Design a protein around this ligand. Structure first.
Ligand SMILES: [Mg+2]
Lengths: 142, 88, 200, 84, 129
RNA sequence: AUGCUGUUGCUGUUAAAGGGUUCGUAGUUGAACUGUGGGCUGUUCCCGUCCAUUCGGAUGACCCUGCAGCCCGUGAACAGAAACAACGGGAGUGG
RNA sequence: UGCGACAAGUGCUUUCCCA
RNA sequence: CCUUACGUAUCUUU
């Protein structure tokens, strides 16, 4: 996390050059869309759908099997989240810090880290309002 | 045909200097670490001929430690020194 | 009006060529005589088949254009089509490439944004190359800009599929220049993860 | 020695050591494997770095355990790595 | 963050050439940085170079032949009229005999000598000598 | 004169000078990609079959940018498709 | 509306259900 | 003429 803090950490997933399903999997592109849209009806957000297909079904990179991405499959089906997944987990983090700070009035470090997550919230929500993924009146809680 | 000319085609400069065979670096007159090494061309019976292969190396390249890597890279290119064993 | 002519576009059913008839007869034959082709061939039909003579001969390539609607249709069933067409056609090497339109790159900066990126000449030409060698996907790609001002694109393939496609590469590299008017040269990579070139 | 490094075509010894993004063309480290359940015996496809705990769809059991790197398969299960 | 990719590329070429290397690895690349290198090939300051395809921005491996002293990038890309070539030659070039100022013009990316002959002007990209 | 006002073109560890640390608006700066084509004609060694036993021998390499015509990706034609981007109150009395 | 030709950058002689 | 790849011990262990 480079934007807030001094971390220069470089740990990512390195996608393959050879963008092709490995020919030992016989699952249809039609069925992967059914499995992706099913997991969203069990409440899974798009980052969690892809790991469950990566780990157990052998579908690394849903984009390569079905030509479109996971969140695009969800937006077509009507199963997109109301606010984006990035903004969800930052708001859900920021409310868990504040419920901590109401009983722990002098947690000096978590009051600093709460400034940083809300700075990320107001900086993402400016992106999503500009790109029209979010309504213009949106305006984070606190 | 090396060195600057006149527009009358007479070679104007004195002293076209040497160049390093590793780094193409023009060897200056005060570069007192710059050496020439003459390697004997040898015949089919393993006795030297009257001809030698001379390669000249700049002084900073010897200063760092990188001359010995450069003499290898030259003599493989000239065909003087073999790069690996033959197959057993 | 003969029944093999369903395996052909309607503009050519009236006056087919000698090659357009020969492919469509063989492509109509492959229902009742083949297993996996029964599921996919009743929908399929070819636009035109164009024959090109390679300068180093003894196998003359036979290039069969089909509508790009049937792209995933053929990919499911390719290497059964090219094997069975080249079996019914002796001494011909059969390519099945889709017919793709290219949008010329707009001068306007606003039209350039609206361009469908599939109709891009860079995107079309890399799909045409994938059609010529379908089971062997493109492992790597390099451009060597040698000193005389020329670029040569080198495409690397997986060395595991050398025996399946070694005779075809001299043909593929020529027909890719017939269709795209670009020059390609091929090589192979053993262990393509670590970018190791085959070296004979 | 006597062979110089070529940056376009690096040695297999040099290139196998590198980080996956510090390669000349970056690529995965992971892979898929075909894991047979210890009872129940039915094959499953398990990712090598599966942070979730994959379940046997037939057996109902969990035949994987996440770690900091590669996930650990259960005792008594058979597995062979899948290609590509 | 990286701002100018051409200024990055010319700085890694010039650094590795004063160290006397045989090859550089340039990352990332562009259409601009290969059109700069092909100016440097035509007047023989570099050798053959090779663009490796990621599905990312590429990488370029450039073979050096000892002839380049310094290549650099002028940032920002100042606009240069046809009357302004003799001003830019006296500022960044060591002599009027050798050395080139590369410009991006309407006709393409060219050096200063070609652009003077075709009577064009452009924005200055960089130099090599 | 004075690169002692520095855009060209200055300094900032110790000489004057980095502001205690983060967030942060105005501001300035900002990653790669959609492409510049093609055709013809000019311009002696070494590798084995006989000898010898911790050191020998007779016996397959290499050598000979310039002008024109392009449906100017490929389809599809042999004007049709592809790609393209009506006023006399008019004209030295309706060229 | 019926009807005669030809296309289609995504196979409707499909895809789901269901027997 | 810039290699198509390679070497594994110690001691504590209901
Ligand atoms: Mg008129």
């Amino acid at each position: 996390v480079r934007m807030h803090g001094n971390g220069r950490g470089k740990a990512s997933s390195a996608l393959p050059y050879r963008r092709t399903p490995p020919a030992w999997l016989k699952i249809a592109s039609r069925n992967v869309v059914k499995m992706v849209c099913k997991s969203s009806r069990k409440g899974m957000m798009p980052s969690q759908i892809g790991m469950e297909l990566r780990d157990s079904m052998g579908i690394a990179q849903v984009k390569n099997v079905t030509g479109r991405k996971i969140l695009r499959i969800l937006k077509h089906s009507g199963l997109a989240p109301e606010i984006p997944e990035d903004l969800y987990f930052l708001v859900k983090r920021a409310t868990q810090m504040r419920k901590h700070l109401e009983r722990h009035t002098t947690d000096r470090d978590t009051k600093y880290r709460l400034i940083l997550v809300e700075s990320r919230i107001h900086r993402l929500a400016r992106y999503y309002k500009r790109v029209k993924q979010l309504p213009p009146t949106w305006k984070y809680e606190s | 045909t090396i060195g600057m000319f006149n527009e009358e085609g007479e070679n104007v400069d004195l002293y076209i200097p040497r160049k390093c065979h590793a780094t193409n670096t023009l060897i200056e007159a005060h570069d007192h670490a710059a050496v020439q090494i003459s390697i004997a061309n040898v015949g089919p019976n393993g006795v030297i001929n009257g001809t030698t292969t001379t390669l000249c190396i700049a002084g900073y390249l010897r200063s760092q430690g990188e001359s010995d890597h450069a003499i290898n890279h030259i003599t493989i290119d000239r065909g003087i020194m073999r790069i690996k064993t033959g197959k057993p | 009006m003969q029944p093999y002519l369903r395996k052909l576009r309607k503009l050519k059913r009236g006056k087919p060529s000698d090659l357009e008839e020969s492919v469509a007869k063989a492509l109509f034959e492959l229902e009742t005589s083949h297993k996996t082709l029964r599921q996919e061939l009743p929908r399929f039909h070819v636009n035109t088949v164009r024959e090109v003579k390679v300068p180093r001969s003894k196998k003359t390539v036979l290039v069969v254009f089909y509508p790009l609607r049937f792209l995933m249709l053929v990919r499911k069933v390719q290497r059964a089509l090219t094997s069975e067409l080249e079996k019914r056609h002796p001494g011909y090497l059969v390519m099945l490439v889709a017919q793709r339109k290219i949008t010329k790159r707009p001068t306007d900066v606003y039209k350039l944004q609206k361009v469908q990126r599939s109709k891009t000449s860079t995107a079309v030409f890399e799909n045409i190359l994938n059609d010529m060698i379908y089971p062997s996907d493109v492992v790597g790609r390099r451009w060597r800009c040698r000193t005389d001002g020329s670029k040569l694109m080198k495409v690397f393939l997986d060395a595991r599929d050398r025996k399946r496609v070694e005779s075809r590469l001299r043909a593929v590299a020529y027909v890719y220049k017939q269709l795209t008017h670009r020059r390609v040269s091929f090589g192979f990579m053993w262990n393509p993860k670590l970018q190791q070139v085959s070296t004979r | 020695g006597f062979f110089d490094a070529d940056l376009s075509y690096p040695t297999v010894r040099t290139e196998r050591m590198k980080h996956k993004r510090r390669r000349l063309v970056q690529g995965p480290n992971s892979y898929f494997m075909d894991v047979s359940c210890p009872r129940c015996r039915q094959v499953t496809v398990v990712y090598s770095h599966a942070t979730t705990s994959v379940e046997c769809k037939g057996c109902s059991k969990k035949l994987c355990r996440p770690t900091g790197g590669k996930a650990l398969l259960v005792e008594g299960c058979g597995y062979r790595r899948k290609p590509d | 963050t990286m701002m100018s990719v051409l200024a990055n590329a010319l700085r890694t070429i010039a650094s590795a050439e004063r160290r006397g290397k045989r090859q550089v690895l340039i990352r990332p690349s562009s259409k601009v940085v290969v059109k700069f290198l092909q100016v440097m090939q035509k007047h023989g300051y570099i050798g053959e170079f090779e663009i490796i395809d990621d599905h990312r921005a590429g990488k370029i491996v450039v073979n050096l032949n000892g002839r380049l002293n310094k290549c650099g990038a002028i940032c920002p890309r100042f606009d240069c009229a046809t009357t302004d070539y003799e001003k830019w030659m006296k500022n960044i070039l060591p002599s009027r005999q050798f050395g080139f100022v590369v410009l991006t013009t309407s006709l393409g990316i060219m050096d200063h000598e070609e652009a003077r002959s075709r009577n064009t002007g452009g924005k200055v990209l960089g130099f090599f000598y």
